[PDB]
Structures are given as C-alpha cells and as structure tokens.
Design a protein around this ligand. Structure first.
Ligand code: NAG
Ligand code: CA
Length: 71
C-alpha cells in the first residue's frame, strides 16, 4: 500500500522518465499515458496504435486502420 509492481522510475523529464510518448509521474515514478486511439505497450514507456476495427462490428461496413484513428 506504499509501493506498486512498478517503482522508482524518474519524474517525467529525463527522456520523459524513459517514456517515448505523452507522460506524467505519480509519487511512484513516471509512465506514458497514451491519448485517445492509442494503448500502452507491455513496457509502459511506449504507446501503440489500436487496430480499432479488428473488433468485429466496430464498423458496420468497410473499414481501414490508421495511426491513432479509423476511417
Ligand atoms: C503484453 O503482451 C502480451 C502479448 O505478447 C499481451 O497478451 C499482454 O496482455 C501484455 N501485457 C499487459 C499488461 O497487457
Ligand atoms: Ca488505428
């Protein structure tokens, strides 16, 4: 209750605490926090595009996937 499985990453400054995307820190250290349309990878210091229409029925008909959005 004073710690987490992730601990003592730097604050969101030194190469964003190692994050390659949008980022902040709680008292435990920095993480990425991906914008709308993106997800956190395993590493929690990088973000990946969601394939928003690999999900069946997200688009009623023809779909294309693009970085951070869909058409
Ligand atoms: C990490 O990647 C695997 C696929 O290699 C995925 O199944 C898993 O959900 C990921 N970890 C987390 C915390 O979601
Ligand atoms: Ca996308």
């Amino acid at each position: 209750t004073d710690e987490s499985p992730l601990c003592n990453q730097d604050s969101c400054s030194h190469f964003n605490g190692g994050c390659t995307h949008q980022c902040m820190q709680g008292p435990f250290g920095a993480t990425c926090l991906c914008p709308l349309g993106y997800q956190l990878a395993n590493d929690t210091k990088t973000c990946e595009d969601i394939n928003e229409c690999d999900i069946p029925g997200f688009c009623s008909q023809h779909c294309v996937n693009m970085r951070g959005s869909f058409r």
